[model samples]
Target chain A: RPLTIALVAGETSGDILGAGLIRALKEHVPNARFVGVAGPRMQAEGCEAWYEMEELSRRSSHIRADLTKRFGELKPDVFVGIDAPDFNITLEGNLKKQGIKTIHYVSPSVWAWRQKRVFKIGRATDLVLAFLPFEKAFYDKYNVPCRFIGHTMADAMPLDPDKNAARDVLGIPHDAHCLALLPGSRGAEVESLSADFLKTAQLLRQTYPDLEIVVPLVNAKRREQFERIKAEVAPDLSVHLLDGMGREAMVASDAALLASGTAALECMLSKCPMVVGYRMKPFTFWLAKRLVKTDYVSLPNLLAGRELVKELLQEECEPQKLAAALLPLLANGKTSHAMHDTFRELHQQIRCNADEQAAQAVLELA
Target chain B: RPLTIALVAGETSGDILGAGLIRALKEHVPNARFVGVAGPRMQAEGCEAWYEMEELSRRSSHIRADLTKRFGELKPDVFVGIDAPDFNITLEGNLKKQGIKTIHYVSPSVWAWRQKRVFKIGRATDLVLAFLPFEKAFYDKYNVPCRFIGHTMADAMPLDPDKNAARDVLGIPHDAHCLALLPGSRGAEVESLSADFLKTAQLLRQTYPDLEIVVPLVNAKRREQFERIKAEVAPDLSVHLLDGMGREAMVASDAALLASGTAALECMLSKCPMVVGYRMKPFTFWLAKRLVKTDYVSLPNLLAGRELVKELLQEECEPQKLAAALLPLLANGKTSHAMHDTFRELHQQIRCNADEQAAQAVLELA
Candidate 1:
């Protein structure tokens, strides 16, 4: 009989990981069926979408109860939940109890802050597929089953990226002074960050009038918010908007002003010099400030164990500071060379055939 | 957890059975989900149609391959196959092998033709629900799990049917002489039987030109075939055509000329004196004549263990012989009184809450 593997993936990043893993799994087991909650990328790779990915991000509770019973009826040989930690952990726990083989791919930041939750996650899944080496080490400390699968973005984004190639696909001239403005993905994140981002582009354009600024919004709703913010913050800035190509826009540019999350890690992988910025609601920031014990807010800095790139949080984040840090990185100089050489090293360090590794780990559990 | 029942019901008769059983099952378990291949009646009872029932009857092979894999994923608590034996028996066997609880709602003619096939049916299904009492006795002799659920039609069709009430629903005049013409439900049946049935009605109309003959065709295609036959055989004959009310038209009818099968049994239950007639293709009859060893072709006669209704085969199925057998039963005389009395006793013998009994039997195994 052909193999049956059910999966649930969240948002675009999870979708990208889903597609690659499904492709690698199918290569091994030609007639293997991959079905569950999926995005366009996952569906494009022939994963029959039982539930749309975008819906899960906005509202897991609405679909969660049905999904819990649905997967029980689905009775696939194995189920893999990729990211969507709060949603997946609880769902995985229930499915695991019902005698379903469960795996959690892209381990949550239980390693970063809620370090003790590794025990809970261990009970929830038969195996956990981690995209980083330290995540596997963290799980191993608790004797939790985890396989280090490396990062798919690191496997995909080249160590020596072609600037002209990225630009050509995006219709940007190779010689142009391009700045990719990545505010954030969520409505609240775009609301909090994009005004400063737009203003930063406004200041940069004063020095380089021919600067081609591009912002990649996740959907029509986010694009509308960016448009509204663009009208409010800096109407005179020459800009182009790409639909849902955050990483591609970063690769097409010389530098990027992006939010500090996976966005920072992807921007780093793009080999583009970057400034990571973030701001939270006043009360949330106050609570998180004491709760989060990590050394750095930016993933790029956290991975390197140093402030390898500038990270300006809350009060330090403004158009003036963001533009000042980004100007030197845009030129082919000492600062630009430092960013490229370090980024290329990070790329080689993390590039370890993640899709095949994750597929093999998932199959091993089966 | 809500109960999940995936079913594959064959044609109109099975569709009718599905709707009633689903309604009764839902009455017991409010949130139970009925899903799978179904027709208009089954869907009308809120069964989620994964595959249309019409498609199953036309070409099971096209959807059968996909359905085999899909139901494995669906993993319904129980699979109930209602009368699609050739299609469902193989499907039920696969599902049973996969460790699913399976119930064949309609027992095939293993009791009549291939007696040894009862053992295979027992392997395919956890339980077989038989409509006729003799069928249950047949299974008992072979030590197969079987339940005699009487018949749903017998329970639904009144023992003393009101002729005026049935006529009112069909918009026929109360005093008009009415005859329900049911040739059969297939294209071949219509091709062979309808022209002769129409010509017999033409012979009946000569004695009473005011006779309002109603022929209930199963679908548009059958109705078209009948219309073409009516034009070719007897264009002068005045007849009313009902869309698909073989049973309904029988109740509205003073007398009927129906082919021998479930239709004959339903006509008997309708308290309508029917002349049963059938003609098979030459080679098929020659083979069936050699292989078959049954006392009666008509189910009504077979159930009664006597010639409860006049059954004409081959040469005896023409207009002159058919019209002669039906004439005496249409009038309010000793012959009509004998027909009505026998039908009422048969109705009472066969009427026993089938839907509820079937539902209880299904739930017991679950």
Candidate 2:
């Protein structure tokens, strides 16, 4: 029998996680369908996309209305949410009410500061899979069922990355001093950080004439947005625009300037010491400030329980401050031993063959 | 663990069936709670009534909202809708879509005439309990899961009813030429039949001054409704009003004037010759006429494949004509021997132990 496994992935990271889980799941249950909202990677891995993953990524409108109806009516054997905690947790709650086996792939990061959310997460999902070991410890204090499944990305990235080999693959000269600018994969993130990211690379290049700039956008739309900002903000700067090479770009670079999200954690796994420069819509910033009681905003900083990576947030997120932070990392000999040690330690803690383990947990839940 | 069985009965007949099934179900599942729209009989049998059966009996507006809100969240172990075809079929469809195990206690008769309905019935119920044998045979042709569990009423009644014993219990004369009047169980049904029923008895009284008429209304509201109509229609006639003894009244009587539904089926089960006089609201009859292409409308006639009892349908269901049909059956020597024998035959054909069978089938489905 073909088991109907319904999945919903919110953005690039989770979409990539879904694609890996799909292949891992197929190994055990070969005939089963990976159906629901899927992105290109998950769709290519044989997920019958009911709606594009971007439908949930860009908007939260029909997620509750349509997914509740579609998922409820379809009555899948298992329902999986790959990140997008706000949408997936709320949706998992609806599917749980219908007695569907719901496994939320990523634990909500908000449970640390927004304490009440863990209880609802307990009600929403049968199990929570966490990348950070401490996330499961936090959930365990409240007796919420959680499994510390290591970061899927961490497992993919090597313990010792070859920066020169990454540069060779992307056709960048080995002697060239380079910087990767990862604006973000999401629309609002790119819109908020693109000009500052483009302008920051210009600020660094003023100091070093050989400083090569590579900004990899996740998709063509995000590509168009960054180019529009680049043309408007720093038209004279020499910028190498890649379609989708976020990890490779981060690995090849001496240092990267990026948004403060999953990509910040990817930069850590890439063995690249990065300065995070990010802003949000003012209204979102206002709400986020009310919710964020912590010292660090990015995953890498939280994993270290300290300011491991520098964050130039909102008012100070412009080029002048961003370049000053990245300028030191542009030199070869200034590698921070603590950054490499903590990054490797964090990577190994969650790197428990995640895709296969996540797949095994879901099948066992069924 | 204790299971939650949600049940909804639309009126008295199905209410009685729900009650019997509740008792039978408790034998196998002692810790289970039978919860939903229950009536007095079901409540007496320890069913936790979320709403009275009369709520579904009286009006159907919030049935979707009320039951959907209640059962949708409550998420019972199993949801059973007993009869009330118009209300139950649609409710079952919604519950089934939400992945609730829905069993409709009685199959709809319209499936025989409106062939398209059988297909929809397949989608609505996980299983169907057919009161008559042929209903399952019809469903089998369509590949729908159906069980011919016989009539719950037949299981309660004896094959050979003791007329004298029933009369003695009701404190009626042993040899009296008696008549039972079952106007209807529902409000609109009593409203449509009470006046005609009372007047028909009056015309019959003129034929036999010593003729005894006993009318049984399922509840106080239906009894009150019948009394109000009797005052306006035939105030001079002496009438016996019983609270809720349709089966006992039918068994005690020589002939019965009843509504053409479960009432006629009960008359056959009681071994009583009956005259079915029924009128639907013009719009309902207008709709029914388009659907009903069968040679006989009443269950007994359909069971016999001939007119085992008379039918006084809409246009011809007035008082004088009803009396004309009742005159022959009330005579002692002119008793239709074929009616008694066929009544016994139909009684035995569907006399299999039903409530236990229904319970077992439901438990196995779970």
Candidate 3:
């Protein structure tokens, strides 16, 4: 019988990782059958999709029930969970207990908060393929089987991206002092953060009259949401709205003002000095404040183990404070050069062939 | 208008805390109108029960919706959440955002796991009245307003309970070597642990044939559950099944073999040497293993910040290991004396007038 493998990815970042991993795994084991929840990228790499990744993220219980029934019947050789800790961790535990080998591809933040989850991860998965060296160290402390496969993003992104090329692609002048404004991709984030982010850009425009503010919308819905807020907050502000050129915008920018999440890491990889800002519903923010273990929320700061970038959260995420934080980063040449140097070093450290390493780790576990 | 106070308690433990807090609050404000969720103890203290405490624990969403409507209409002066962090934190956050002052009576384990929750807790409550000094210290680090009001349990339980009197009350022979067994209060726990506990007793009976064993059942249902397991595992073993004298059973016995939870703390307070054993559904245990941040699961060990008692969990919670661990504790020796000394010291540290102190903290916030 051909070896059957189950793969699950939850979000866009996981999708890219899943695609590369699928390609790498196929090269190692030609007769292996790939099946489970996937995104477009994973499917493009010839993975048989039981459910779309978006469906797993949204209707988790429905997909979990479906998968549980399917897994019992199919009995895959190994289960690989990509980036969806809540859904995948529990699912992997269920499958693992039923005598199946399991692998959690992206290790959850056990080092930061909910560190106890590491024990659960140990029980659920035979092996964990980590993106960061620090994550594997955390697992090693608990004596859980883990491998540092490096980061797919670091492997894909260039150490020195051409700023002029990005500007040309976006139809912006090379001399223009550009700023990438990413409030966030979600509707609630745009609702909570768009006004403050836009107003900060309006303030920046006053300081540098030739400031070119570029906003990257994740989708058509987000574009409409951003437009509505832009109209209400600062209709006369000359801001370039791109469809989905977030990376290009970051590459072309002199400085970036964005939400505190994966985008901060992307900005770092793009070698753009940035001020990270974010807000949520008071209740959600209040709850999150208690559960999160880390001192810093942004990825760059977490990875560096220090504040590599400014993070303005909740009350501090106002237009005045955000504009003030961004002003120095936009103007200071020394700060920009230092930030880029640190980012390049960090990039090199994590630029190992993640897909190949992940494939090898998963295969050894199986 | 009279000062309208909203109080919610989710379980029996929270109810005890709630009742004490309500009585103490009345001393500070004579004409305060107490409303919201309550247990029998709180109702006995003149609290107007809008919903039963059981409803709050089981049907949280239903009660939350009902309370949200009531809170909007009533517009209480302040809200007090006694334990039940899951329900209360979100409730407090919602009410706090609506400009209503909120207080959480029991501080959740922010220091243990989900340390980020401290931020949410800071936003949710005007003040946090903590039972343990360590909890307040944890909150203080996060700049969350917390008062170390001490423990109500220590205030309620005597510093030196008369062990001889407890033995006499339970009608056990003075010279008879005895052991107390508490599988757990919940049905699932009783089902999972009773067989192992009984078998351990059976194993112990081999060496000490004249050994007396007492089992405290929380209710008739738990008694039947224990009986069924005892019959299946070791029916020939003579065991005394008590109705509700759990504390008396602990005092009457030389040592205890019990499930790991609040019962372990109760055993400690009783000054009885004990070995904690526990089992859970694999999935639930796996999940809890990750979420729980403390090194020790049992309260006695957690409070002591060291393994004062043996903890045999899941796979390790077998009859042979439990029997082995309990044997030394059963025999009167230096280990038993050392544990009692530690328990006495711990008891002394937490015996401050908790109700009065909690009331003072809440009044200051109000």
Top candidate on DockQ is: 3
For model 2, the superposed segments whose C-alpha errors exceed 4 Å read: A1-16, A29-77, A84-87, A110-116, A184-203, A218-235, A279-366, B1-366
**Order by TM-score, highest first:** 3, 1, 2
Per-residue lDDT of B1-366 in model 3, one digit per residue for the tens?
787778899899888777766666666566767888999998998889999998863577878877877886788877878878878888888887788778777667632234456788899888887655545667889898886655555455565567689989988887777788888888866887687677767766655677778999999999998898888888888989999899999866766766645665566556555554543332223223332445343334544566655654333333344334433432325664465456445444333332232222222222
RMSD of each candidate?
A: 39.3, 39.0, 27.8
Residues A1-366, candidate 2: write the lDDT tens digits.
Answer: 467788899798778877777776666567778788899999999999888887763357655678899989998878888888767888999989999877777666542234456788889877777665545776898888776665555555556668788898898988777878787788766786676566555655555567788888899998888888878988888878998888889778766666555665566556554454444332222223211435333434434556655644333333344334433322212343344345445444333432232222222222
**What shift in Å separates residue A180 of candidate 2 from its native position after superposition?**
2.3
Task: Kindly report the docking quality category of candidate 3.
Answer: incorrect
**Against the unseen true structure, what C-alpha lDDT does each candidate score?**
0.65, 0.65, 0.67
> Taking the tens digit of each residue's C-alpha lDDT, what string does model 2 give over B202-263?
76665557778899989999999989998898887897899998888987886676655566
Which of the CAPRI classes, incorrect, acceptable, medium or high, describes model 1?
incorrect
Question: What lDDT is reached at residue A270 by model 2?
Answer: 65
In candidate 1, stretches whose alpha carbon ends up further than 4 angstroms from where it belongs are A1-366, B1-4, B10-16, B31-76, B110-116, B169-171, B293-366
Per-residue lDDT tens digits for candidate 1, residues A1-366, read 467777898788889777777776665566888888999999998999989998873467867777889889877778888788878888888888889888887768522233446677999988887765545766898999886655665555555556688898899997677888787787766887777677666666655677778898889999999999888878767688889888788777766666545665565556555454544332222123212334343333433566665543332333344334433432335764555456444444333332232222212221
lDDT tens per residue, model 3, A10-63: 898788777776666665556767799989998998889989988753568878
Error of 3 at A63 (Å): 5.7
TM-score of 2: 0.35
